[PDB]
Nucleic acid binder design. Structure first.
Lengths: 185, 149, 129, 262, 151
RNA sequence: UUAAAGUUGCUGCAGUUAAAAAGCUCGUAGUUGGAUCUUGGGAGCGGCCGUCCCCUGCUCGGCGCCGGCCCGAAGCGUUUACUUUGAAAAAAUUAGAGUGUUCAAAGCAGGCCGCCUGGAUACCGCAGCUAGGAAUAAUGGAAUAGGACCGCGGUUCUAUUUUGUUG
């Protein structure tokens, strides 16, 4: 159907249902001419601390810029067709290990793990562009990243920072908090 | 500080931490690539191409609106100059100070500055020979100064 | 020019604790610098520090306490074994009861008692007490 | 010099000959024989300092002219005949036999054996030689040239010879999992099982032997010696059974024996 | 190209003077080649198998035995014929001043003519052989190219 | 002659005035060189945490079963320094085990009424060999793409259990 995987395996019920839901969502809207080559790769269902849920949707890299300017609408047709499930878009990226002397093309530095994590964090929320990043390193030796966002479009992002922290702790495992600075601009 | 001067200057650019295309820019990558091609057929050095594009077309840098830097597109199309910009300007300055020193034999300050220009030409030539940009047989002489523009 | 960022970092934090300041900035970052402050933070000689993640090289805001006496750097990084470490500990620590030698072995960067326990050696960075 | 060396000083002797330091200037250099100069035990030092049969160097040559000492079943009148490792010394008068096996330390030790054990002797082959009209030959470590063995004999495996006829009875294949003797170097006199062998082309190969108590050590391939199939030997072991126990455990057992003796 | 000298050059193992039948073409005038394997995990190049040259000091196509030590180094000059000179670099330790010493010494190595793409600055692996001359005690086995030279 | 001598200073000296910065600048050899490439957990254990198992891949064969599972091997995986272990590295001398030469410097003896034994152990600077880790420092990919993988099209010599005894 609309779901296309890089590997030959059958998807589950949930991501097939999300693909069908977006199939009628592009069918009944005026965006059918803008999603002819725009597809979905995979989707999951995870949990966040509290009484809320979350969903993640994977997008390939060379079609990501098509989904960047359509994301501002597509998310809230997804909450107007759901009850309260907040919807985020992320770009998929493969990870390669460091080539040790114990174990071929040179691995390009776009596949660097910290670069992949940084790209995941910046592309996790689009309209609140990051303006600052600090790392709290507490006395137990663990790191606690805090990320500063844009002053503009603050009201439509502030209700989803807990979901952002939950999905970043689920996919990667870093305690990430969000703050809104007001000093600069 | 400087490399042949006692000054210790702090005056250069400072690019912002934000690394995204601003919303006020309504240009694509192919349009600014075509502008680079047209301004290179106008025959100008890539740095001043960046100056004119930043001044007139509102673009911050090409490398933040296109995935690659300006000399790399200029080499990919096949119209970049064979000699680098700073080497060409250093050789031009050497030609200028030598042409000044032919008619003025008593200018010792100009002779000292000619020594400094020749030393910087040699030190840049070593690096460009190292990075396999220039052939190993290219040597800088006064007689080849007027021959190579 | 700047040929050792770690020596300048430890000299700056030494001057800051000697004057009596509470917060200091270190202009460059390195992974080895973060490991060094992680060793001193696990040993409780410096407070909880920060990383100013700017796209050039991270600036480090270290909280200073009065528990630090001197931070030093041995340049260059001298090769040290298990049999030759006792001489360094004798002529470089102020006493046998306190002070630590930070040396880089293949299993990480930490104090010399832990490297004694794992029976490994390497190159020395510096000291603190 | 202008020729072969002929004298030998006291401190130029190997430590396993293991004499004193002030009784003379010269030590007995052995005559030429089947063994090397370094790892051998002369008859004169054995009869003078181990069994204490004779006190003076003329008494041992009187014994050798009296024709009472046989090495490998033949009467040897040489006073400095080198009796090396894995040799049987038979005395016809008193009626006891001695076999030279290294003990838990790096020295030769006496080992009284039965006469029924005293009719055979093990050898290690050095290289395989094919003769004139295709005669398979032997080069043992005791300079014994044997003609036509079993065709399964290789470079490293050990053989058993009969002393009266000089022919092979049975052989032990060199495989991983056989009983071991080490001869030479630091690890000298330890009983273990051969576990791993690695090949180094262009250099010496090193093996790995695990002892009965779990201790492991490595020796060169040229200093290996197989004595038994599996863990069962073919000769009689000396006291201690080749363990090389530590000096702390040796101190413990010595003080326990001294406290029990009183 | 070959036998430009008053003494004939030939391999002392292959008999090249057998009797022929038709005295012409169709399956003839193809000289057989003698070669051998050095061992130690090394590879014989195909230029020494399909080659035509005659050299008695070649490790592959010659009466040269390889044993002993294996070294490495970088070449400096190719001036004298069929033998090269390489430069070896190592770190020496001084006990008093607890630091190190970068010094060098060079040696003359015989080069087999099966390598014709050799240039200045490539890392070569040499092997110990018989004394072939007064200053020559090593021979070239494998050649690894320098950094770069993509075209 | 050594210590004294931090008056030869590698650890560990001094150069404004006591001995001592070339008049100044360029510059090859020499020495020294910015940041960045994998981060974090799981099944357990005692009341958040120490020790420990896990995050290297394709031709032959034994702790075991009914051509399918796994494990083990003749052969291979970017090279250096450094780190740890193992081999070999003569004795005497140095440290040092045992031992009433009357004690001791010395010696390797000796003690139980034929027997029991010792005659160890460690170090041996650098260089050469071998096996675990890849932190630290330098070298490399693919950029005028002949880049890495995958199935398809041809230029040459040959494996015989495979075209009835023989051309």
């Amino acid at each position: 159907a609309k779901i296309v995987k890089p590997n030959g395996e059958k998807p589950d019920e949930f991501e097939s249902g999300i693909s069908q839901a977006l199939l009628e969502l592009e069918m009944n809207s005026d965006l059918k001419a803008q999603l002819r080559e725009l597809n979905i790769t995979a989707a999951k269902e995870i949990e966040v601390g509290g009484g809320r849920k979350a969903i993640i949707i994977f997008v390939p890299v060379p079609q990501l810029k098509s989904f960047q300017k359509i994301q501002v609408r597509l998310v809230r047709e997804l909450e107007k067709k759901f009850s309260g499930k907040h919807v985020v878009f992320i770009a998929q990226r493969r990870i390669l290990p460091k080539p040790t002397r114990k174990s071929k093309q040179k691995r390009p530095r776009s596949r660097t793990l910290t670069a992949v994590h940084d790209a995941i964090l910046e592309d996790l929320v689009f309209p609140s562009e990051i303006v600052g990043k600090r790392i709290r390193v507490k006395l137990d030796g663990s790191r606690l990243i805090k990320v500063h966002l844009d002053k503009a479009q603050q009201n439509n992002v502030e209700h989803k920072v807990e979901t952002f922290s939950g999905v970043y702790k689920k996919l990667t495992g870093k305690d990430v908090n969000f703050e809104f600075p007001e000093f600069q601009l | 500080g400087r490399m042949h001067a006692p000054g210790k200057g702090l005056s250069q650019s400072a690019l912002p931490y934000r690394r995204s295309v601003p919303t006020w820019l309504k240009l694509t990558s192919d349009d600014v690539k075509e502008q680079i091609y047209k301004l290179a057929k106008k025959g100008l050095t890539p740095s001043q191409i960046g100056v004119i594009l930043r001044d007139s077309h509102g673009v911050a840098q090409v490398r933040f609106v296109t995935g690659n830097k300006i000399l790399r597109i200029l080499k990919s199309k096949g119209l970049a100059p064979d000699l680098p910009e700073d080497l060409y300007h250093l050789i031009k300055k050497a030609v200028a100070v030598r042409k000044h020193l032919e008619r003025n034999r008593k200018d010792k300050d100009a002779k000292f500055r000619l020594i400094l220009i020749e030393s910087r030409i040699h030190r840049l030539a070593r690096y460009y020979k190292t990075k396999r940009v220039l052939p190993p047989n290219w040597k800088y002489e006064s007689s080849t100064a007027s021959a190579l523009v | 020019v700047r040929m050792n960022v770690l020596a300048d970092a430890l000299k700056s934090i030494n001057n800051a604790e000697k004057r009596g300041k509470r917060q200091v900035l270190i202009r460059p970052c390195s992974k080895v610098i973060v490991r060094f402050l992680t060793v001193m933070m696990k040993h409780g000689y410096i407070g909880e520090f920060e990383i100013i993640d700017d796209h050039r090289a991270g600036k480090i805001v270290v909280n200073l306490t009065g528990r630090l006496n001197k931070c030093g750097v041995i340049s260059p990084r001298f090769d040290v074994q298990l049999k030759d470490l006792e001489k360094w500990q004798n002529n470089l620590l102020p006493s046998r009861q306190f002070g630590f030698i930070v040396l880089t072995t293949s299993a990480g960067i930490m104090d010399h008692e832990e490297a004694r326990r794992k029976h490994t050696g390497g190159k020395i960075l510096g000291f603190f007490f | 010099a202008r020729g072969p060396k002929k004298h030998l000083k006291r401190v130029a002797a190997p430590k396993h000959w293991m004499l004193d330091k002030l009784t003379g200037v010269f030590a007995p250099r052995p005559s030429t024989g089947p063994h090397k100069l370094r790892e051998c035990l002369p008859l004169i030092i054995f009869l003078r300092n181990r069994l204490k049969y004779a006190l003076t160097g003329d008494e041992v040559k009187k014994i050798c002219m009296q024709r009472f000492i046989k090495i490998d079943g033949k009467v040897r009148t040489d006073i400095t005949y080198p009796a090396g490792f894995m040799d049987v010394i038979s005395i016809d008068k008193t009626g006891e036999n001695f076999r030279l096996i290294y003990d838990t330390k790096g020295r030769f030790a006496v080992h009284r054996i039965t006469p029924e054990e005293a009719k055979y002797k093990l050898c290690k082959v050095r290289k395989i030689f094919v003769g004139t009209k295709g005669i398979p030959h032997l080069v043992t470590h005791d300079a014994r040239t044997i003609r036509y063995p079993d065709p399964l004999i290789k470079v490293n495996d050990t053989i058993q010879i009969d002393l009266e006829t000089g022919k092979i009875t049975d052989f032990i294949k060199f495989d991983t999992g056989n009983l071991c003797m080490v001869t030479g170097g630091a690890n000298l006199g330890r009983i273990g099982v051969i576990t791993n062998r690695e090949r180094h082309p262009g250099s010496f190969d090193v093996v790995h032997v695990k002892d009965a108590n779990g201790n492991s050590f490595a020796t060169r391939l040229s200093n290996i010696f197989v004595i038994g199939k599996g863990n069962k030997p073919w000769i009689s072991l000396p006291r201690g059974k080749g363990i090389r126990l530590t000096i702390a455990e040796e101190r413990d057992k010595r003080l326990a024996a001294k406290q029990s003796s009183g | 190209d070959i036998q430009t000298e008053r003494a004939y050059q030939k391999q002392p193992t292959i008999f090249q003077n057998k009797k022929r039948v038709l005295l012409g073409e169709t399956g003839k005038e193809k000289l057989p080649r003698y070669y051998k394997n050095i061992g130690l995990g090394f590879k014989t190049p195909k230029e020494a198998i399909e080659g035509t040259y005659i050299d008695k000091k070649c490790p592959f196509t010659g009466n040269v035995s390889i044993r002993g030590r294996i070294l490495s180094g970088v070449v400096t000059k190719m001036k004298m014929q069929r033998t090269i000179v390489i430069r070896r670099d190592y770190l020496h330790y001084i006990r008093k001043y607890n630091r190190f010493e970068k010094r060098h010494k060079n040696m003359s190595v015989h080069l087999s003519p099966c390598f014709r793409d050799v240039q200045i600055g490539d890392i070569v692996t040499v092997g110990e052989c018989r004394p072939l001359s007064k200053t020559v005690r090593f021979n070239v086995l494998k050649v690894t190219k320098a950094a770069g030279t993509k075209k």
